Design an enzyme around this catalytic site. Structure first.
Site, PDB file in Angstrom:
ATOM      1  N   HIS A  87       3.475  16.704  46.626  1.00 26.45           N
ATOM      2  CA  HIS A  87       3.238  16.015  44.318  1.00 26.45           C
ATOM      3  C   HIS A  87       4.053  15.733  43.874  1.00 26.45           C
ATOM      4  O   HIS A  87       4.366  14.916  42.941  1.00 26.45           O
ATOM      5  CB  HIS A  87       2.473  17.070  44.853  1.00 26.45           C
ATOM      6  CG  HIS A  87       2.380  17.688  42.499  1.00 26.45           C
ATOM      7  ND1 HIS A  87       0.602  16.822  42.199  1.00 26.45           N
ATOM      8  CD2 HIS A  87       2.644  17.837  41.562  1.00 26.45           C
ATOM      9  CE1 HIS A  87       1.445  17.386  40.740  1.00 26.45           C
ATOM     10  NE2 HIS A  87       2.312  18.118  40.821  1.00 26.45           N
ATOM     11  N   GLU A  88       5.204  16.588  44.078  1.00 29.00           N
ATOM     12  CA  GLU A  88       6.272  15.784  43.280  1.00 29.00           C
ATOM     13  C   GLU A  88       6.718  15.331  42.877  1.00 29.00           C
ATOM     14  O   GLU A  88       7.176  14.342  41.970  1.00 29.00           O
ATOM     15  CB  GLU A  88       7.699  17.189  43.374  1.00 29.00           C
ATOM     16  CG  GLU A  88       7.239  18.239  43.226  1.00 29.00           C
ATOM     17  CD  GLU A  88       7.421  19.350  41.947  1.00 29.00           C
ATOM     18  OE1 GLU A  88       7.961  18.384  41.135  1.00 29.00           O
ATOM     19  OE2 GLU A  88       7.002  20.111  41.529  1.00 29.00           O
ATOM     20  N   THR A  89       6.681  14.136  44.290  1.00 34.02           N
ATOM     21  CA  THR A  89       7.066  12.813  44.535  1.00 34.02           C
ATOM     22  C   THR A  89       5.786  11.316  44.395  1.00 34.02           C
ATOM     23  O   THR A  89       6.102  10.667  44.614  1.00 34.02           O
ATOM     24  CB  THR A  89       7.679  12.665  45.250  1.00 34.02           C
ATOM     25  OG1 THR A  89       7.014  12.746  47.126  1.00 34.02           O
ATOM     26  CG2 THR A  89       9.472  13.106  45.515  1.00 34.02           C
TER      27      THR A  89
END
Ligand SMILES: [Cl-]
Ligand SMILES: [Cl-]
Ligand SMILES: [Cl-]
Ligand SMILES: [Cl-]
Ligand SMILES: [Cl-]
Ligand SMILES: [Cl-]
Ligand SMILES: [Cl-]
Ligand SMILES: [Cl-]
Length: 246
Positions: free
Chosen positions: A68-70
């Site tokens: 999700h972060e990336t």
């Protein structure tokens, strides 16, 4: 011991991260399975705590959150938005120094910017500082090393995962059923589960229904990965009924 190659194969790694080398992505060829495996050897407890199912669930949760972060996915992306993890290795917007001077322990270096880098999008002097100390890197003076070396990139993310930041427990403790919630945690609806992990990582801007979209994206990566490892995602997967930590 501490080599995760028996728990997650190279083939599973690249099937999870199906589109990260695509034209639409930005860190093409950067994140490798060898790098992840090397980084993990530095945190022996990671992916080596509990029985087989628990070990696999920890890897699934770590990749669920970092995906999700990336992420570079969107509704209608090829094979589904939950196949677009690891599309970025750092923040697009690099204009903000991310230097916090309240209760200052960790000095900001002049002309350096602590915007999100690596799989957990590590941000702010108060993360680069202790992370650099724990890893033996001068991350405050040269924070770009966290996005120029894939092993360092992964080590920053695993560092984050393994490190408690009171009142938040470590992500590692939550997913390995080692976290004992305070009575405040319980009255706040912070019950052990992937939802608390979301809360640890960015609850202030996402949990308690503040950004359902981002939380749903974290959950979609996680459940996909659990399905691939053949483990159960568990309950308390969402954080819409949890107060943020503070
Ligand atoms: Cl390990
Ligand atoms: Cl590789
Ligand atoms: Cl999805
Ligand atoms: Cl910089
Ligand atoms: Cl939420
Ligand atoms: Cl299971
Ligand atoms: Cl389940
Ligand atoms: Cl909840």
């Amino acid at each position: 011991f501490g080599d995760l190659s028996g728990i997650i194969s190279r083939d599973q790694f690249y099937k999870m991260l199906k589109h990260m080398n695509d034209n639409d992505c930005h860190a093409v060829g950067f994140f490798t399975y060898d790098a992840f495996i090397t980084a993990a050897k530095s945190f022996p407890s990671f992916g080596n705590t509990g029985d087989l199912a628990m070990r696999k669930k920890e890897i699934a949760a770590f990749f669920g959150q970092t995906s999700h972060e990336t992420t570079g996915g969107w509704s209608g992306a090829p094979d589904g938005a939950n196949t677009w993890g690891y599309c970025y290795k750092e923040a697009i917007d690099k204009s903000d120094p991310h230097c916090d001077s309240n209760n200052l322990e960790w000095p900001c270096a002049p002309g350096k910017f602590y915007y999100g880098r690596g799989p957990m999008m590590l941000s702010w002097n108060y993360n680069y500082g202790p992370c650099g100390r724990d890893l033996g890197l001068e991350l405050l003076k040269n924070p770009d090393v966290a996005s120029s070396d894939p092993v360092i990139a992964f080590k920053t993310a695993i560092w984050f995962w393994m490190t408690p930041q009171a009142p938040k427990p470590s992500c590692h403790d939550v997913i390995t059923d080692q976290w004992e919630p305070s009575a405040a945690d319980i009255s706040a609806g912070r019950l052990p589960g992937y939802g608390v992990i979301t809360n640890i990582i960015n609850g202030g801007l996402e949990c308690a229904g503040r950004d359902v979209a981002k939380v749903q994206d974290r959950i979609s990566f996680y459940t996909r990965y659990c399905g691939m490892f053949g483990v159960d995602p568990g309950s308390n997967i969402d954080c819409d009924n949890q107060r943020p930590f503070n």
